[PDB]
Amino acid sequence: DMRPEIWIAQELRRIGDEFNAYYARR
Amino acid sequence: DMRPEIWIAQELRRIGDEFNAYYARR
Amino acid sequence: DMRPEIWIAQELRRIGDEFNAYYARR
Amino acid sequence: DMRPEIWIAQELRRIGDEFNAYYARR
């Protein structure tokens, strides 16, 4: 869904989730 | 707290909260 | 400013791709 | 690369500042 209030929230979760997965592996 | 797992998460919440507040006003 | 709000989602995707590339190097 | 993880927080702050300036124009 490219409507901005869904898409922005999803991108923020992607950034946060990928950082946490990286940092746990690090 | 500038430790990365706190600071990154807080910047993400700032971006998301500021967007939602703006979009409600818009 | 004429930009649609999706510019924010697009920029979050772009920067998240930079973070992703950095994690993979590490 | 060898960048500190806080480069991510610093970049999120910088882009969040751009988003904030956009909200003020809108």
From Swiss-Prot, chains A, B, C, D:
Belongs to the Bcl-2 family. Isoform BimEL, isoform BimL and isoform BimS are the predominant isoforms and are widely expressed with tissue-specific variation. Isoform Bim-gamma is most abundantly expressed in small intestine and colon, and in lower levels in spleen, prostate, testis, heart, liver and kidney. The BH3 motif is required for interaction with Bcl-2 proteins and cytotoxicity. A motif (BH3) lies at residues 8-22. Forms heterodimers with a number of antiapoptotic Bcl-2 proteins, including MCL1, BCL2, BCL2L1 isoform Bcl-X(L), BCL2A1/BFL-1, BHRF1, and BCL2L2/BCLW. Does not heterodimerize with proapoptotic proteins such as BAD, BOK or BAK. Identified in a complex containing BCL2L11, DYNLL1 and BCL2L1 isoform Bcl-X(L); BH3 integrity is required for BCL2L1-binding. Interacts with YWHAZ. When phosphorylated, interacts with TRIM2; this interaction is associated with ubiquitination and degradation. Interacts with MCL1; may sequester BCL2L11 to prevent its pro-apoptotic activity. Interacts with GIMAP5. This is Bcl-2-like protein 11. Deubiquitination catalyzed by USP27X stabilizes the protein. It comes from the Eukaryota. Induction: By ER stress in a DDIT3/CHOP-dependent manner. It is found in: Endomembrane system. Induces apoptosis and anoikis. Isoform BimL is more potent than isoform BimEL. Isoform Bim-alpha1, isoform Bim-alpha2 and isoform Bim-alpha3 induce apoptosis, although less potent than isoform BimEL, isoform BimL and isoform BimS. Isoform Bim-gamma induces apoptosis. Isoform Bim-alpha3 induces apoptosis possibly through a caspase-mediated pathway. Isoform BimAC and isoform BimABC lack the ability to induce apoptosis.
